[model samples]
Target: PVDSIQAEEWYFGKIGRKDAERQLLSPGNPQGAFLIRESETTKGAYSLSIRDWDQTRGDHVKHYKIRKGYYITTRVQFNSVQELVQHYMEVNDGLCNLLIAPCTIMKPQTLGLKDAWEISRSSITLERRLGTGCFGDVWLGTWNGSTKVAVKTLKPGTMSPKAFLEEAQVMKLLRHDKLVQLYAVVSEEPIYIVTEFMCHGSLLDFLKNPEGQDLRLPQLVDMAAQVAEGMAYMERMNYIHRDLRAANILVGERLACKIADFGLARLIKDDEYNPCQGFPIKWTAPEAALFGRFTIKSDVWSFGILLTELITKGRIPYPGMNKREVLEQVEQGYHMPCPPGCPASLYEAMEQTWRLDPEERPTFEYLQSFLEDYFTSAEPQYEEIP
Candidate 1:
């Protein structure tokens, strides 16, 4: 039935080409696994991407454009995109291979809190305490009796209600796989900010755990890439995290890393701004720590410290020095030497972020791509037949 065909299991609307390719090439997706997505370049047009394996090139993906006029590779037209997909499934025609199945679908990492940003206090039940912070305590809780959540409470007199709500508003607008998802905000006294639960807790603690200590260099790089990807999204949204460090990042199942602790995040309104008191001297950029200057580049600088933390398995930056000594040394143009066993390439990139001039640091977008490419190129390769 056309209605059943329109179920569109193979259709992935509006995802970018890179995302489509990643899905197609993901492990367990067989060759010929394919999906259709809206073309990034053209409105209404779609694209067909499929995973393929080559003897010489190893694994790869190929894409074909599908015109909105229903034409695909030829003048032949179909009644709808579904009809075209059905026809291609029957015969390869001009495609790389016969469409065998839709690409592997990964479970969504975060729930969208689009319309239901506010929730009744009755729907939540606080359980054991997770941790304590400057603002308040985080409790492991359940929402609506089933869904696991982390409830962050605000200590009385700690911050103005208006400022606290502003942070919630900022969190409500920002959503991405590599960033913690805000589920609900209780606006009354002793405010509670609810978010998705991360079972593994903070990345800092995770690295110190015996299991996390077993993680190899590649795994650490993968975590760094995840953080960079999140920061890139936040950068594009014109927000500065103000605090980006391992202690602020949460780790979930499968060693997934998600940026958390948005209490200091603010939407950028100018080139730079002065942040409030209490910056992490070790992770903060020189300008930020010295002159109260905060920018996305400063966030980049913090990411460099985070890279060191991952490499050293949660060792604090400037390990032997106190806060004042660390600041004084940083002011005197001192950067921490590369961690033992840290790759030279990664150390070099880390040093780039620590450059004294914030303007000289690379953007999160560049860092994300660089880390991704670095990880891919670092994969073990088979020797060529001579």
Candidate 2:
């Protein structure tokens, strides 16, 4: 995510004349340079800050403010004057997990340090691989040794550093046996996150599995219970996953659905509770979608949508409609019609979750107990790896 420049090209007539140029373009060419204060104010276009130089490789960008001749000295080489400029592309990307994982250090390792994770670098491995997202091409690798993890590096179209940071903060604090764990992050290496891998497919997939058609209703409820439990834990901690969808919930080995991706989450305390701030329209409480309000009850609305997903062969929460459309439908007192093959109990739960009044919804703890009772015979493996 940085531009590599030759020592001579960067420093035409600076001190150390010949040696500076020679060392910069050489192998293991240091990827940083000395910081330069601005001579004349060069206004930044994208962000609010002002700059004096344009140090970026691309000529068309509104984010970075690089002066004509100088840039903020970053990652200066060992015993060398030439420096490597941290490209503007990765500024927000790095801030996401970089701030949470490893340490809260802002800049990358330059002289005294090397890479984001100084001592933790030994556990990282690199490889270009497939990742799931709209954020361009991503690379896959392992973190903390044998753990299979994917680091999806994207150009970042919709989300900025702030949005990504929210996800990082919430994901780091969240821990449940059913949920995926974010081990750490190496922001300076390639823009990516270090998370636990789920080998089994998503919950929606298992519901649609042709071979597993006869999978018991109790088992499915138990699976939903795991999701309820993990999310319950988050609720207890006062965190709300703003983007709760079927795809975001990964179903692991023991019919356990781990809710991942906290990018759109919001942290709240009992005193500051507002269900409206964090609920998605499709899975949101009717009151939330209509009036933009949320509470613990709104979460019940989301759980209802999730139940519909778990039971109705993984049907989309609102068929043929985006969240905006679903919000409008909700405002008009609309809800999903019971499909022919859907179970009555699941529909009952769904309706209970979707009650127009926010106060009438069930709590996650109650839902968990309900699921455990529904799936009475399905014993939790707990530590059973297989």
Candidate 3:
């Protein structure tokens, strides 16, 4: 079903409830995804003065200089209203929704502003070390009597609280079943950022599990699809997940997945953001690997690498090729081969993301459409593992 609330809201907020909708849907206006006003630009020809909001341009009300000639060539391409909706809706849905959970903006104290929820050092108890990342070790911790939560403590002398707070603010602005949840931030020394505990841990580690390795191929396909759904949401919000790979994906008790580790993520500005540090070699795109240029496009490239990881059962990408080797070859248009048992069509989807030019790379929405082919195909189903 269409989201009626969001549809009505967009209709009123974007156009207007009283004055504009009638004017836009007037007898002269052509019905389509956009509101239009027509004028003659040449003999037997017309021009369309179209009003639409450009989200990338700060959601400003903007007009399109679309002549009839341009419209005719494009109008034939859309087979259904569904097509137009998919095209337009890809970037914004109520502008943005972390989905499955509403976004709640917290105060500076809870966020980055001088706020700290004291988890008395005494009440908190650390158990076995779960694992480590660039920032610090992720410990299995219990608060008070028996509440389990994962604590990611900042490594001393490694990163400033200010930098970690940036990640905290980013997480505060987003919430979804497909994205990890942040619980609280501690105010005391040796700071801790608390988050929900994922029973299965990272996708890489999970895939290495004997059962995960034995999971049905279709189940692995489902995992990749879930990641796409989350990343697609990020794409619409103009957020770049600077680090997207198998290791950053966490698996739940039911083997469901969510994107985790937001330390390298932020909203994308017009130009490439400067990279003050190195990125994962195997997953970095050519433009980003060489020029330090990063964008949602670059993230798509990394997602392609992630697909390889899933199909190979957690094998490192570009094996036998050093970081320098992969860089030189990737610039020359080399990509990884299809993993064993990977469908040809799915591999084509991966190839599309690894396009040489960043702009040439397919958007996550585009990639997901291709994946749906494998998902919905009539192939016999294999027994799924939990």
Q: Give me the candidate number with maximum TM-score.
A: 1
Candidate rank order under TM-score? 1, 3, 2
| C-alpha lDDT of all candidate models, in order | 0.81, 0.52, 0.64
Clashes of 3: 2
Q: Deviation in angstroms for 273 in model 1?
A: 10
- Over 117-186, each residue of candidate 3 has an lDDT whose tens digit, in order, gives 4445666678878877676777888766455678888877776666655566677767754678777767
Model 1 lDDT per residue over 86-117, tens place: 89899878878899999864432322355366
Put down candidate 2 lDDT per residue, 82-173, tens digits, no spaces: 32233322243321111111101121232245332222545657565655455434355665555565554435554444444334455566
- Identify the candidate with maximal lDDT: 1
Q: Model 1, which residues run further than 4 Å from truth? A: 1-115, 133-135, 155-160, 262-278, 378-386
Q: After superposition, how far is residue 258 of candidate 1 from its true place, in Å?
A: 1.0
Which portions of model 3 miss their true places by more than 4 Å? 1-124, 132-135, 143-147, 155-158, 262-278, 378-386
TM-score of each: 0.70, 0.56, 0.63
